[PDB]
Symmetry: D2
Subunit: 333 residues, 4 copies
Amino acid sequence: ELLPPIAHLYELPISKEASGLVHRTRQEISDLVHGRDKRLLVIIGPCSIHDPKAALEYAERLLKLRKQYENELLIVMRVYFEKPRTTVGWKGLINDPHLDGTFDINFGLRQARSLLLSLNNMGMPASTEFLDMITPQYYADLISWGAIGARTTESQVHRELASGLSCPVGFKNGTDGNLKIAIDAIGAASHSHHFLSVTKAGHSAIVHTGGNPDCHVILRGGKEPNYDAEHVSEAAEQLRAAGVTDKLMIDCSHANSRKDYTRQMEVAQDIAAQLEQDGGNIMGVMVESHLVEGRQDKPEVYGKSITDACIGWGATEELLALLAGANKKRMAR
Amino acid sequence: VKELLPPIAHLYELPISKEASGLVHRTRQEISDLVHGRDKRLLVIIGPCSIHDPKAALEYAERLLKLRKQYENELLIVMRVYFEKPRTTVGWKGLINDPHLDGTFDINFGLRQARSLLLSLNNMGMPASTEFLDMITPQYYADLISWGAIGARTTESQVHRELASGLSCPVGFKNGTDGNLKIAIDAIGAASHSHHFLSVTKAGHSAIVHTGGNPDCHVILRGGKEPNYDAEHVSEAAEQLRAAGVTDKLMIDCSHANSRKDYTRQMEVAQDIAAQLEQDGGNIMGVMVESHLVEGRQDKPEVYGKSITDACIGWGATEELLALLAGANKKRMAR
Amino acid sequence: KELLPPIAHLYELPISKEASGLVHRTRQEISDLVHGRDKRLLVIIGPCSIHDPKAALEYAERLLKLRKQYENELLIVMRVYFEKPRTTVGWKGLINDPHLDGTFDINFGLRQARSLLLSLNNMGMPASTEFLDMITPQYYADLISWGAIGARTTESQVHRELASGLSCPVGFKNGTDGNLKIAIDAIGAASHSHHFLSVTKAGHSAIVHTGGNPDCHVILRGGKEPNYDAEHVSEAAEQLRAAGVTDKLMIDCSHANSRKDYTRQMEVAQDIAAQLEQDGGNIMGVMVESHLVEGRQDKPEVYGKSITDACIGWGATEELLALLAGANKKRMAR
Amino acid sequence: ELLPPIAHLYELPISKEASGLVHRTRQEISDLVHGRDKRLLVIIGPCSIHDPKAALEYAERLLKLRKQYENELLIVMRVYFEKPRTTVGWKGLINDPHLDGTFDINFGLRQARSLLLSLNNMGMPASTEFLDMITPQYYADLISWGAIGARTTESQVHRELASGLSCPVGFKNGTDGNLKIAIDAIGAASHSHHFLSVTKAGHSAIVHTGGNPDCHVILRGGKEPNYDAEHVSEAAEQLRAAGVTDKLMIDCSHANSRKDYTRQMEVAQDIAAQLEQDGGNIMGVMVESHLVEGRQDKPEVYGKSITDACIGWGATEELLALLAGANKKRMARA
Ligand SMILES: C[C@H](OP(=O)(O)O)C(=O)O
Ligand SMILES: C[C@H](OP(=O)(O)O)C(=O)O
Ligand SMILES: C[C@H](OP(=O)(O)O)C(=O)O
Ligand SMILES: C[C@H](OP(=O)(O)O)C(=O)O
Ligand SMILES: [Mn+2]
Ligand SMILES: [Mn+2]
Ligand SMILES: [Mn+2]
Ligand SMILES: [Mn+2]
């Protein structure tokens, strides 16, 4: 029997501190999306959260780099709770918290909220992919930035959802490299919509959204990678042609790394080079990172991904120093 | 946030009848048989791109009904009764979302009107098909639907695969808007399995549902960068379907990216399909045709029985096309 | 079983401009009687219980002409009782068992009740009922111009709570053995704001915060002995004033005041008429159990005849209203 | 914005131990009601719970007597969360937990469940008055015995509620002494009913109850006390005449004590004397007891009632020893 959002909000109300961090971080990101600040947003963390203990440890380490680079980078943790599978598979912590096919969703949602509250309370803002239609009411108030995945960008119900989120939202290009669907998606999500959704009390209702002003595109690769300068420039021209923001984000992972975690660094280096030469259209990057590098099918090793392979903590330090140094130069112009 | 009546309210005013229930049951089975190769009739999903007027749709049904009966040994005719439309950016999302066509978004009326029409259609002997786009609306009218599509833009979406996994009707997954067929094959795999996810009950309250899987899914070739209707394309698709361990019987959409911005090309496509059915065409179990009383399209709903969404062929062309397919499939069935 | 929420019935049967206006008006007009601003006599009259809408519509049609005829002396409002409190067990009314066969088709019952109430208000006839259940009122309350809380539930806090949140005037009946203080206590209670659990138009439980009902009053319905007469009214008015609440009250001609003998309602009416002639300043209303055809029956075989408490018939009803109208015309002249 | 029962059941699931205690205690009480065991049920504790700390402390002390006297008495704590007022007033911990007019009902219901779980976990079963229609779904699973109050015994919605409780239920005679309404009530509650109620998920629904076979009456005084032998005998005769159990419970407090806390001991002494002589129709008693005696308007003194005045802990030890000694003799005859 599903507990409604209000049950979880009662046990874990948002705090003054978390509320302020979310509010502030959303604004700060808005400023990047609309070209009012030239810091580089960095969405970085695990492909998926499967352990909260490890995620809290990861956050603790990342928090120090968030503070150290705060003049060059705006660091936000990937705290992904919902995973889109190619066919079937584990859909994430909310759907299957115990990782055993028991689908204890009430526990999952509790655990997700708790972790998010803790993260915000320690000073680390959170980001996630919004995949399910009904789960967001549980934890959305604790999210500073949202992704709509490559597999759902073209979907109208996801564009509808985005249109009503209070956080900035990144739409990824399609799994074969279609960028126009993400540009279309900003157009869609920036408008007001009417559709069916569920309330904080667990009942279905008609909602009227005001539109999300702060959407942007994410280059995640397709058949071929789309990260490089030619690709960014091409994208920016298409964005301007559609009358939407020409500031975009580049995913170092996934189709841009050809599903090879050791290539995220190459992509980061290419981005760094663009930031040095010009790179005026770049406002963010995305990196799949964890305590320990690689991936594993069963959750045997602590702080190691059970979804997409991540770079480890050492490589993570390198990468952030690389980007911070490069962006400091861009901001000096 | 505005008041929404739960499904049970609409089920109370418009309960399914013995007859509609039996037609739905029977038609789902009949389609299952096509999907799994037990019957060589050709499913034909045919009707408007979208329903915007119930009067016209009832009239269209009246005429189509006679052909459904006339061709029942060769074709299994089912009407397109599409209530939910996926836009490229923004636009009118269909009768449920905006029944009045004026931006009033009177969804309670929409859902009532949709159920009423569907009940009337089934009652007169015409089965109905629609695209399932929204997650929460299906509980309102799903019991009146004999076949469902998941659109090109949502086939890759996991929530749509989940929804499909719990529908009691056969379901067609369309290839992607640029021609990706693997996403539809992946989608059958997904939807055929059991899933656990959040959904809303007949009473309007969110809940965890545990679906049993949908064994009757299949692929639809709707074009992409290049059309995928012809024999080479069908054969390539059947090989990929067999490789994935799912049914190699598929459906071909004559409309959309296969007709490539001419409604009248649907006839060319139908002719090509007819030729395949004559030569061999063993992998084809269905086709899809965008048809209305009057041909073409219009931005405003000024002309009766003319589409306000994608352009359709008219009634005359519709008669030609069905006779063509019937004649051709009679031959395939004789071998 | 799957209960439809109030909004489902409100969608099919929205209140009309006309019904809405009649309800609003009639509640005000009654308020005026309760607080002594108008000397017309409220008359709550109709069947003990509604078991057939056809008959009730026919009854209303006839009563409507007397309501118009006597509108300067009487304010006539129909008893349209959907919920019945049993001594032990029994048929609890149309909402609970509409088919009268123990099928308990409550969704139908509530639909039928609302439909009837809408039709009644639409034709010009205001409606009254006893509010017994906690959750049913959300379905039809908007169509009710006056409400009773029964003798068996007046002392109950959940009924006082419910009353506190009704937008219509409410009569509290004295207890089944004649206790009047519980009804006076009940006005105190219901006049204040309350917080308690209730169900929304959407069918979900919720905390409600009521504003209080300023239009409550007492009803004398008999006990071990009848309490209708002048000595009893005077005694009651003194107790009401002592508690700081309205000393205008209503007298039930039926039930314990008639000693469960329908032919005595007329005696009681005559005694009330005499009081209205002599003085009767504390009386603002009466209650009469009336139908098309007099008496009662266990099974619903005869049309327009009660299956609950025995009622007077249409002829006697015409007599009684003329009696009260004539008597009250005199009181108003003073 | 009201949380549904499932939210509280998720945070505070019933334990194996509490579940077993409830199950067992309900059976043991059933046995008393139907004359299969001659122990004396004792419902004892505060008039109302306003502080959980004090209630847990009270329980701790009572638990030792429950164990000491377990062969003669079956002791169960009064843990009353809902209070019926004469007019207006504080309605109990659930309605206003903070005691300040903030009506924080979500907190109240949480606190009530938590306290009840703790009580059952330590070995102390709980009893309460069921007043509200929607609150029971929150805490009912933790209750071993239920009362329907003097003010609501005649009410059909309370008889309906009772008909679906899994615990034995005592119906009190009316505030002026009417016993027949309680006998009628057992008749009613023992039958199946159909009515509207709210689910564990917080949505309204139609419920079909199976009937409660374990109801009995409670003598709690009226205009005059009804505790004595003549009154018991007279009640038993009426009970037998109605075909329901002639084993009853006697409240030492309220009308019987004449609203005087000191008086309860007298009543207990009279009951003890009946148990010695014969007292075959008595299965239970009710006592209003707390740490400290008397009452107070504001919650200034710890463990002292803010509702009806209670006897203190000392007097409580005296009373239980009195009843235990007396009932040991009754049980020896057999
Ligand atoms: C899988 C997902 O990215 P996508 O494949 O949607 O680009 C993710 O962010 O890990
Ligand atoms: C729009 C939809 O088709 P799709 O573009 O998903 O093939 C339809 O059938 O009208
Ligand atoms: C039963 C009820 O009267 P009461 O007994 O509450 O005075 C009625 O008016 O039918
Ligand atoms: C007040 C209530 O009992 P009653 O007055 O119903 O006998 C109680 O037990 O506190
Ligand atoms: Mn990933
Ligand atoms: Mn179309
Ligand atoms: Mn009556
Ligand atoms: Mn008390």
